[PDB]
Design a protein around this ligand. Structure first.
Ligand code: ADP
Lengths: 50, 53, 69, 380, 158
């Protein structure tokens, strides 16, 4: 039994936090950055006038 | 049990009229359907949708 | 082979289930008692779990020694 | 089971004061009003982050905590020293009083220690059920998802097997793990529609809050099949929607498929979920998944619905609806394409055969991957 | 009281009801109680002071409790359950009905029980609580077997 350290074993040097520390399953879209939807809908209502 | 049942019966007549007039058509224009039913377009479209969903 | 069905082997009635013939409250006899009969339906009305825990022993055999009344 | 419920309330108040900085004036007020009470010094190592290091009650409040804890400790020492009561005796409830002191007054660490101690000591059915319930409640208090998973695992595995009619008293918070997590789609609903509460208004802060969780979970769950005969038929459901008009408002808006009110009500729903610690689907399944379902429902039974008219039938801002459709098609759902040169929504709904064929070829891909992995497993 | 009802007076009838209390606590309990019930119903009939009717009847119930006229106060509690259903009250009508049922099943009144069960069925139907409404209505039938010819009540049940 060997760990195959011959291949470059660059362990992740953060050791700070697990971003998804729970069982949450992310999606490629789920991590986009926006002001959610409530503010966007408010802006839509404002530009339409109400 | 007055407004509720009247609305239910109104929906029953809408569905019955649509189903009674719909058999012949493999594809019919919805404004023609509205003309036969003697109604507007938006309400007829909404009813046909709610039926087919 | 083993024949799966068992009721029609000798007929003697069958699955009168899934069929409303006379529902319940529609009966004219009101209760007579009918409380011991709701007690008898408690076991069909789940409550086998509540038979335990509470420590009760639910009834099993219900004889009704009445005339056709 | 009443304890740790006002603790849940103070935990949610700390959440509302910490995560949203918009609530920084009324949140401070409610946090202070529920922290100067409830003896919050040991449960103030968490509260020091938002407000000051310690509110100005230090002397009196710490004296009260230390006096109460010392009195309970003296009682426990008496029971465990002067009397040799072992196993099936009153020492079990004495240690329960110890744990209650260490939890409702002291920090969670001593409470967890006393719990684990008496759990390893006595394994009776009632005692074990009570301590499992307390562990679940303290885990859902302090947001230790690891502890929540541990207690849920042991309860669903063996603890709930022994003893009945108490799983009906426990599932409402046993499914809180799925509630607080992303899994609000199928399992949480399937085990959470059960309207059998262990208490009239407890555990999840109310029966009304329980219902709001049910409504959110069902809305994430499905769109509009015989949901009329699943939840709408619920008499208690209709009663609680009468109690909450806005909740009834968006629920009936989704059921009626009237997007003009649906989108405003859905934004209100997302805003409400923000004020809630169960906000795990912050960008996935607040409103985007629900409108994915709604748009599927809408454009299905349609072929080419114009963008300009679907925009006013679904709110305003034709450009807003166009960009939303583009983003969601890129996300993967909303089986359709956009004719931009003519501004049309040409859907592509596969037939029953076509879509199910696609599902079978997808699963064939997954299982060819599986059997290739198993062919790797063999011959080595 | 009859002339006040004929004319449509509210303040005068309220004052008379608040005044006749010594005469109420001087005669047969049943007769005084039924006079109180009739006067209250006649007052609540026409003039719809929705901000005063409930409060006045609650004051009357508290007075009846002080006088220890249990059947009187129960009758007025049933009347306010009816008024709550009339005013579309959500769940306060419900818990008042539950309290009445708890107080009354220990007794053996029958007309009050039938009226309470029928009102509970009515408010379940108003809140669209169909299965609980059906259960309450079945209990209402089981209780209402007792009264042989209550011509108004039988029509209400049907
Ligand atoms: N609502 C009702 N209440 C009581 N009896 C009824 C009702 N409706 C019908 N019946 C009668 O009850 C009878 C059942 O009689 P039967 O089964 O022969 O008596 P037994 O069970 O003693 O042999 C039926 O013949 C039917 O006419």
């Amino acid at each position: 039994d060997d760990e195959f350290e011959e291949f470059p074993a660059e362990d992740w040097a953060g050791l700070d936090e697990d971003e998804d520390a729970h069982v949450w399953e992310d999606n490629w879209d789920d991590d986009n950055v926006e002001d959610d939807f409530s503010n966007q809908l408010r802006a839509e209502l404002e530009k339409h006038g109400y | 049990i007055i407004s509720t049942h009247l609305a239910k019966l109104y929906d029953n007549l809408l569905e019955q009229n649509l189903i009674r007039v719909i058999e012949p058509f493999s594809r019919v224009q919805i404004e023609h359907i509205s003309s036969l039913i003697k109604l507007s377009k938006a309400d007829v479209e909404r009813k046909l949708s709610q039926m087919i969903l | 082979d083993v024949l799966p069905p068992e009721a029609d082997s000798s007929i003697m009635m069958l699955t009168s289930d899934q069929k409303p013939d006379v529902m319940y409250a529609d009966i004219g006899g009101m209760d007579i008692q009918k409380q011991e009969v709701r007690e008898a339906v408690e076991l069909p009305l789940t409550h086998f779990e509540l038979y335990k825990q509470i420590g009760i022993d639910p009834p099993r055999g219900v004889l009704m020694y009445g005339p056709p009344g | 089971g009443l304890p740790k419920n006002p603790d849940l309330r103070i935990a949610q108040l700390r959440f509302l004061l910490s995560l949203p900085e918009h609530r920084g004036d009324a949140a401070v007020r409610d946090e202070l009003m529920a922290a100067v009470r409830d003896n919050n010094m040991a449960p103030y190592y968490e509260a020091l982050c938002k407000s000051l290091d310690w509110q100005i009650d230090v002397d009196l409040l710490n004296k009260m905590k230390k006096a109460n804890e010392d009195e309970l400790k003296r009682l426990d020492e008496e029971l465990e020293d002067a009397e040799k009561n072992l196993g099936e005796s009153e020492i079990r409830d004495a240690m329960m009083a110890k744990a209650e002191y260490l939890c409702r007054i002291g920090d969670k660490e001593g409470a967890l220690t006393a719990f684990r101690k008496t759990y390893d000591k006595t394994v009776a059915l009632g005692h074990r059920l009570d301590i499992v319930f307390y562990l679940l409640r303290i885990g859902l208090f302090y947001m230790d998802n690891d502890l929540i998973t541990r207690n849920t695992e042991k309860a669903k595995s063996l603890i709930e097997e022994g003893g009945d009619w108490d799983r009906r008293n426990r599932l409402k918070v046993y499914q809180g793990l799925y509630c607080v997590a992303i899994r609000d789609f199928k399992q949480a609903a399937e085990l959470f529609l059960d309207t059998v509460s262990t208490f009239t208004s407890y555990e999840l802060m109310d029966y009304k809050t329980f219902v709001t969780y049910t409504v959110y979970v069902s809305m994430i769950a499905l769109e509009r099949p015989d949901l009329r005969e699943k939840v709408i038929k619920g008499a208690e459901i209709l009663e609680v929607l009468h109690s909450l008009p806005a909740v009834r408002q968006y629920l009936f808006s989704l059921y009626e498929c009237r997007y003009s009110v649906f989108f405003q009500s859905l934004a209100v729903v997302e805003q409400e979920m923000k004020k809630d610690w169960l906000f795990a689907p912050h960008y996935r399944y607040y409103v985007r998944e629900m409108r994915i379902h709604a748009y599927s429902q809408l454009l299905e039974s349609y072929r080419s619905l114009t963008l300009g008219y679907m925009a006013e039938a679904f709110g305003v801002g034709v450009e807003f609806i166009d960009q939303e459709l583009s983003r969601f098609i890129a996300a993967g759902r909303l089986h359709c394409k956009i004719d931009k040169v003519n501004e049309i929504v040409e859907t592509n709904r596969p037939d029953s055969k076509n879509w199910q064929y696609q599902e079978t070829i997808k699963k064939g891909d997954l299982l060819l991957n599986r059997v290739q992995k198993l062919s790797r497993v063999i011959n080595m | 009281g009859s002339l006040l009802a004929k004319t449509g007076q509210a303040a005068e009838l309220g004052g008379l009801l608040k005044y006749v209390r010594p005469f109420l606590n001087s005669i047969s309990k049943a007769k005084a109680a039924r006079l109180v019930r009739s006067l209250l119903d006649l007052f609540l009939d026409m003039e719809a002071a929705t901000g005063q009717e409930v409060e006045l009847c609650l004051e009357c119930i508290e007075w009846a409790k002080s006088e220890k006229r249990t059947f009187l106060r129960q009758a007025l509690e049933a009347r306010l359950v009816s008024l709550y259903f009339d005013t579309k009250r959500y769940q306060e009508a419900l818990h008042l009905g539950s309290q009445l049922l708890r107080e009354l099943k220990k007794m053996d009144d029958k007309a009050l029980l039938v009226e309470v069960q029928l009102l509970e069925s009515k408010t379940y139907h108003a809140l669209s609580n169909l299965p609980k409404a059906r259960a309450a209505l079945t209990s209402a039938r089981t209780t209402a077997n007792a009264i042989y010819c209550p011509p108004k009540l039988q029509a209400t049940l049907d």
